[PDB]
Amino acid sequence: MTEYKLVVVGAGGVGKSALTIQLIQNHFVDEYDPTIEDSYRKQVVIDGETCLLDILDTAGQEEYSAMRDQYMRTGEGFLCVFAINNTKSFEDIHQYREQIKRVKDSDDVPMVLVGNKCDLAARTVESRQAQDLARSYGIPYIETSAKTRQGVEDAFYTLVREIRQHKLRKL
Amino acid sequence: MTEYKLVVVGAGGVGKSALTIQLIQNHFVDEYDPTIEDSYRKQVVIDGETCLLDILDTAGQEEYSAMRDQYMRTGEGFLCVFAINNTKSFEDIHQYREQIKRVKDSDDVPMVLVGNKCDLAARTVESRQAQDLARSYGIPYIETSAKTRQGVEDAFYTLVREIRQHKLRKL
Amino acid sequence: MTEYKLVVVGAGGVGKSALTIQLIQNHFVDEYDPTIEDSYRKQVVIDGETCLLDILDTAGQEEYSAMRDQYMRTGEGFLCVFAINNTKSFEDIHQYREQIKRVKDSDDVPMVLVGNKCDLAARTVESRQAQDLARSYGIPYIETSAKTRQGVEDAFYTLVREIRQHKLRKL
Amino acid sequence: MTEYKLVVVGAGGVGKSALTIQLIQNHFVDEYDPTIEDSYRKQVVIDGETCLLDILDTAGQEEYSAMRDQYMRTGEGFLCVFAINNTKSFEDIHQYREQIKRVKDSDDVPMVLVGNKCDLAARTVESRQAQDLARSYGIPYIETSAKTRQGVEDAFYTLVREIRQHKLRKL
Ligand SMILES: Nc1nc2c(ncn2[C@@H]2O[C@H](COP(=O)(O)OP(=O)(O)CP(=O)(O)O)[C@@H](O)[C@H]2O)c(=O)[nH]1
Ligand SMILES: Nc1nc2c(ncn2[C@@H]2O[C@H](COP(=O)(O)OP(=O)(O)CP(=O)(O)O)[C@@H](O)[C@H]2O)c(=O)[nH]1
Ligand SMILES: Nc1nc2c(ncn2[C@@H]2O[C@H](COP(=O)(O)OP(=O)(O)CP(=O)(O)O)[C@@H](O)[C@H]2O)c(=O)[nH]1
Ligand SMILES: Nc1nc2c(ncn2[C@@H]2O[C@H](COP(=O)(O)OP(=O)(O)CP(=O)(O)O)[C@@H](O)[C@H]2O)c(=O)[nH]1
Ligand SMILES: [Mg+2]
Ligand SMILES: [Mg+2]
Ligand SMILES: [Mg+2]
Ligand SMILES: [Mg+2]
């Protein structure tokens, strides 16, 4: 069985824990209850491969920067989240991505760009501009609704396929 | 994630467009304007790989300014299309074929032969005839109906499989 | 074609026979009952590979200290089963696994932990515990019910895969 | 796409041509027209691989036995067929198998045991001694019916799988 180290990264409030929790436990989290760091484990088959998803749920709040360094060392792939109703979240993602590359050096680093809360009728952020970005980045993009569970399994499973490719035809 | 430049080549009225928009907009068009150059991107997974399909819907028809020249050079794979109910559409294939080979300088070129309009009870091109040409070329031939969307995914994923395969070239 | 030698072990009455019969005879046969130890066979295709599964159904009854070493010795992978409503059979898993680690003389030996009787209401062993143990062993955890057939194939086929994967560290 | 060279062998009267023509044309052939040697080509997708199947249909007629050395020299894999209501032909696969080995000078040659005519109630060779012979040989065993089409695609696809596995044995 293969173990994959997924880190859920992103601006505070964007829906990280809720993403993570819909996966792990299949129920939506209303409570906005911050995070320092929380671990989750999940066994799934993806493309007929028995996978152990070891997901690290991180703190998005202005602080906890510094760990924002060693979980980046450790992570094998990042869910970069932001929220379709928040543009600054959209915007700081370039930050998160630059920090990552710097903590690993590597220019090629499994990441997936996730547009959360898409159940919200009120986007200040356009799929297209998200796409344009994932594009210049070289990475997939998926719009999700932790609330409605939609695209949740794809976000995570896609990130596994990214890592997996990255370890094998990543040369 | 792998991005792939695929070009939809052929003759006017074949169905290049219908084909295309069916793959992307997932719906059928007996209405699209007679083309020159129009682009499409599709994010998808094939063979557990996340793929970004960069599709150029080219044109044949009447006049067409300046296209052909260089789209080859950049095209990675070519979908060479013809209609089942048009014998002349079919002879033309050998000619698109031929320019690619010259622009590409090789016979490396990934292509998939497609016989569109699998739905007409008005065939004037025999499968057996198409199969041979394919066989001559040593490339796949898939019959399609943009109308009923029969075989359309196959055509596209087949060509991407070919590119994929081709990339192992002297490694 | 590959031959795969599977050995099912667990405490008496966990459902080892049933489980095997289900995969093989395709029905829940009840009182197959203890002490008769047979090997079954089944050709099947897993992930495009054709496999000959040679399954040994050990008689967990007047168990261990039969010629158990024989089989643990010629086994390539072990299906380690316990019943969901029997804590001791779960407790016993630790003993089977040490025996297997001794006889195979290796810490990494393909095996899958199985919680049989998914079906019974009267659960004594929560899934969390079994999953934490497997996690601790680096092995998959599947819940089955030989009775409703749920989970049965996944259980064995997750095993051939463990086997297949493990094979990869030879050379 | 990949090209695979399949040869169907077996005593006369067994179902070789009716197996090959069902695959290729999807029609049962009621008449018995003895074969010398026919070639067929069928393009298929196996396990996401675009395979061009070059199928050789050979003579069961002992008379044309001189042409075997040749087809055995070039074939990559052998569909070994016998009829479920004719022991002599079950007895004959043996001699076919030994010739292939000699010609090929190898113990591992892709083959598949095919017991055709699954549809006849006058079966005379039980699936168990076929299954047993197969395991001896170390190859798959498929029961087929050219008249009903049952098992025929299993039969050819399984041979493509053997070939591929077998080739893989070096990359
Ligand atoms: N409508 C909607 N609300 C969502 C969705 N995802 C999360 N939320 C809401 O957004 C708020 C933040 O969710 P949470 O998962 O805690 O975000 P977080 O990024 O983990 C925040 P932190 O950095 O502090 O850990 C919660 O009130 C939650 O219910 C979604 O897909 N749809
Ligand atoms: N029945 C049927 N009609 C089709 C199919 N594909 C295309 N057509 C018909 O072909 C006509 C032209 O299709 P279109 O895709 O625009 O042609 P083209 O090859 O794009 C044209 P151009 O080369 O000039 O850009 C339309 O009326 C459409 O209904 C198909 O699979 N089945
Ligand atoms: N409800 C339920 N009962 C089951 C299930 N599997 C087995 N059983 C029950 O367990 C009893 C014992 O099953 P068996 O398969 O013989 O277990 P065993 O491990 O072979 C026992 P032994 O090692 O002694 O031969 C069966 O008689 C049946 O009542 C299951 O998935 N669900
Ligand atoms: N009931 C039944 N009859 C079949 C089946 N396959 C073949 N037959 C019949 O058996 C006869 C021989 O079939 P054929 O395909 O010609 O056999 P062949 O072994 O290719 C003979 P040869 O060596 O001369 O080429 C035909 O009458 C055919 O219709 C089957 O699966 N079921
Ligand atoms: Mg959180
Ligand atoms: Mg067009
Ligand atoms: Mg038993
Ligand atoms: Mg014949």
Short mmCIF file of C-alpha atoms in Angstrom, two decimals, chain A residues 47 128 131-132 134-135 138-142 158 161-162 164-165 169-170, chain B residues 1-5 40-41 43 45 47-50 52-54 164 167:
data_model
loop_
_atom_site.label_atom_id
_atom_site.label_comp_id
_atom_site.label_asym_id
_atom_site.label_seq_id
_atom_site.Cartn_x
_atom_site.Cartn_y
_atom_site.Cartn_z
CA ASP A 47 -7.15 3.80 -10.00
CA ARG A 128 -11.46 31.30 -16.03
CA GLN A 131 -7.88 28.27 -14.86
CA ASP A 132 -5.62 30.84 -16.36
CA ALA A 134 -3.48 26.87 -12.72
CA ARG A 135 -2.39 27.01 -16.33
CA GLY A 138 1.13 23.78 -14.72
CA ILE A 139 -1.36 22.27 -12.38
CA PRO A 140 -4.92 21.14 -12.32
CA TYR A 141 -7.74 23.00 -10.87
CA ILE A 142 -10.93 21.89 -9.37
CA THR A 158 -6.19 14.39 -8.39
CA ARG A 161 -2.29 11.32 -9.24
CA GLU A 162 -0.09 14.40 -9.33
CA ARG A 164 2.29 9.63 -8.23
CA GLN A 165 3.16 11.09 -11.70
CA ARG A 169 7.37 10.29 -15.27
CA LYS A 170 8.56 13.19 -13.59
CA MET B 1 -0.29 16.96 -15.27
CA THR B 2 0.42 16.76 -18.99
CA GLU B 3 -0.74 19.42 -21.46
CA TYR B 4 -1.25 18.15 -24.94
CA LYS B 5 -1.50 20.11 -28.24
CA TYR B 40 -10.38 24.56 -26.63
CA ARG B 41 -9.04 23.27 -23.40
CA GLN B 43 -8.96 19.07 -18.16
CA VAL B 45 -7.89 12.12 -16.63
CA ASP B 47 -5.28 6.24 -17.74
CA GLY B 48 -5.18 7.81 -14.23
CA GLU B 49 -3.19 10.80 -15.64
CA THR B 50 -4.40 14.32 -15.37
CA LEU B 52 -4.84 19.21 -20.13
CA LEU B 53 -6.13 18.86 -23.71
CA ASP B 54 -5.22 21.84 -25.76
CA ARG B 164 1.92 9.58 -24.92
CA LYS B 167 7.03 10.45 -26.40
#
